[PDB]
């Protein structure tokens, strides 16, 4: 008898509600101003990654914790509408759904206040129920928007079952636990996160190569430093010379969430196209992220398989 | 079949309060982590309506929210407080109104209001409510929806003999003078009075002088509220200012206390029309002073059963 594929991509990480007010000018202390418009959106790195992987066709499972509040109820509905398993999406009355409140002016300058909230209450017991699902997956994906101890335990669970680990140390912290390096099959961050992690400055592809080598020697198997619109730089234990995977300048409409589109695409390729070279996967993941920058609205900008070139889902070199 | 006739009609605003607590206020380009977030139901219109309802008024909230979660939840909030939502409209054309607040530990804040769907409440929307308005005792308006809409609600009320209670909040320096001539009772606070009149108001006496400027612009009754100091009242027939005190209470959270006063006053005007204005304002001051002893805006507004029975008695 036929049955559905089990989840090949498991994401253990965050959900946040984006609360966006547009204004003419940014307020300062003591001020009340009237803005033009307000936007709510579904964000959080974990969920964003998961939504991009799902839309490419991955079978995914989101392990996370939201509030027993309207925001959390709505986030669950969002995951379902994107065909994501919520078997291990947990709700707690002990905190509100995490929030990223943003005030932004017409130039796109902003003030942002994050309250991690229920994300920080995702614990070991919560993960242990997912041990079997994790053990049958192809890729585990973590960031640093939940308790770091909880991400460390999810990478540990994956690694003990032979499951590929994709770790996005974002947002980055200067004293990152060095177990994260050892436990990461693929360690992927952006320029400013690389600076935080290494103490070096990173303003070009060459700089990112130097920073990537520092991280590699701390115990990573593959290090990728993303360069926003400019592509990425990659090195590995097998090929420690840095390689810049460049891109063509596209006209950006809204880049919010593009980093997570890149990560979620890389997760999809790692799980479903394991015989592609890493270089080929990064090329394709760069292209997909670049699709997301041509439309507004973060998750709403993430492309579906059916709208993307057929060749992204076929062999190219073999 | 057994209509409940609403005695108090509020035509005004609903807003969702979105509050993040932080160590410090962020400035341009900065991202910070705060330590708590919470949501509340606000908007001066709804606040006022809520308080009047909890005193036992049959109320109807004429307002517009989004077809979004905030709006659906606001509607439920109104129903839980026993408020008619017959003319609570929902629109896809904008989001429910929002007040996004960032507050540090010292209590200093940054606030961004998006009026949103509140501005889309138009004169056609009110015309469907003509019959409800015409059977009410009191009509209550503020300045958080389009002014033209409030003006038309005051006009409709006045055409049917319905008492008009107008709260010019937040205040604007060049307020349309029609608002004075359409108001049976005009109620604002000290800093709103300053904005309206160009005068300084730091004491009950100063408020009396400001209240007289507003009275002469065409109001019938003017009340200037003074927070813990009570209020000052004047009228066309008794133009001498009268200071109505409030007995001292320990404040826990004063947010919404002005709306509590105004919603109480609406209740008394509708259900206790033979009480002297002085006795109404005594009782309304007490009620608002109850609200300041608890946190959470609408969640602080007392019910009838939490108050002394004498607030709901009347001599011959
Ligand atoms: Na985008
Ligand atoms: Na209060």
Subunit contact B18:A19, Cβ cutoff 8 A: yes
Token pair of A240, please? 């420690």
Active site residue B206: no
Q: Does B18 touch chain A (CB under 8 A)?
A: yes
Q: Which residues of chain A have a CB within 8 Å of the CB of B110?
A: 27-31, 103, 111
User: What's the Rg (C-alpha) of chain B?
Assistant: 19
The coordinates were experimentally obtained by X-ray
Residues that place a CB less than 5 A from ion ligand 1: A 254, 292, 301
Give chain B's count of helices (H) and strands (E). Answer: 10, 14
Those residues with Cβ within 8 angstroms of residue A168's Cβ, 6 or more apart along the chain or in another chain: A45, A49, A141, A142, A143, A144, A188, A189, A263
From the CA of B299, how far away is ligand 2's center (Å)? 8
Does 3.40.1190.20 match the CATH number of domain B1-316?
yes
> CA B118 → CA A228, B139, B226, B267, distances in Å?
39, 18, 28, 24
CATH topology of domain A1-318: 3.40.1190
The total of other beta-carbon atoms located within 10 Å of residue B278's CB is 11
SS3 (DSSP) at B145: coil
SS3 (DSSP) at A120: helix
Tell me how close the Cα of A97 comes to any Cα of chain B, in angstroms.
9
Query: What number of CA atoms fall less than 13 Å from residue A269's CA on the CB side?
Result: 25
Deposited resolution, Å: 2.0
B203/B80 Cα distance (integer angstroms): 39
Closest to A8 in 3D by CA, of A59, A68, A49 = A59
Within its chain, how far is the Cα of B69 from the centroid? 24
Token pair of B9, please? 């009609």
CB B20 within 8 A of CB A99: yes
- Delimit the domains of chain A by residue range: 1-318
Gaps in chain A with C–N over 2.5 Å, residue before each: none
The total of other beta-carbon atoms located within 10 Å of residue A318's CB is 7
């Amino acid at each position: 008898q036929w049955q559905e594929e089990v989840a090949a991509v498991v994401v253990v990480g965050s959900c946040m509600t984006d609360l966006v007010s547009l204004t003419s000018r940014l307020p300062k202390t003591g001020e009340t101003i009237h803005g033009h418009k307000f936007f709510i959106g579904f964000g959080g790195k974990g969920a964003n990654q998961c939504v991009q992987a799902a839309r490419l066709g991955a079978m995914t499972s989101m392990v996370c914790k939201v509030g027993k509040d309207s925001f959390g109820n709505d986030y669950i509905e969002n995951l379902k509408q994107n065909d994501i398993s919520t078997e291990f999406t947990y709700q707690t009355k002990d905190a509100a759904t995490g929030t990223a409140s943003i005030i932004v002016n017409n130039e796109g300058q902003n003030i942002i206040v994050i309250v991690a909230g229920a994300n920080l209450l995702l614990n070991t017991e919560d993960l242990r129920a997912a041990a079997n699902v994790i053990s049958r997956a192809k890729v585990m994906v973590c960031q640093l928007e939940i308790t770091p101890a909880t991400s460390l335990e999810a990478l540990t669970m994956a690694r003990r079952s032979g499951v590929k680990t994709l770790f996005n140390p974002a947002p980055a912290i200067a004293d990152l636990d060095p177990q994260f390096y050892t436990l990461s099959d693929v360690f992927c961050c952006n320029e400013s996160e690389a600076e935080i992690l290494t103490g070096l400055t990173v303003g070009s592809a060459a700089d990112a190569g130097e920073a990537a080598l520092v991280l590699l020697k701390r115990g990573c198997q593959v290090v990728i430093i993303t360069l926003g619109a400019e592509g990425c730089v990659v090195l590995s234990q097998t090929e420690p010379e840095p390689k810049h995977i460049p891109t063509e300048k596209v006209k950006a409409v809204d880049t919010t969430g593009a980093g997570d589109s890149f990560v979620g695409a890389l997760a999809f390729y790692l799980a479903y196209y394991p015989n592609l070279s890493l270089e080929d996967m990064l090329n394709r993941s760069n292209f997909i992220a670049a699709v997301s920058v041509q439309a507004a609205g973060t998750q709403s900008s993430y492309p579906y398989k059916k709208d993307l070139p057929l060749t992204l889902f076929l062999e190219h070199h073999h």
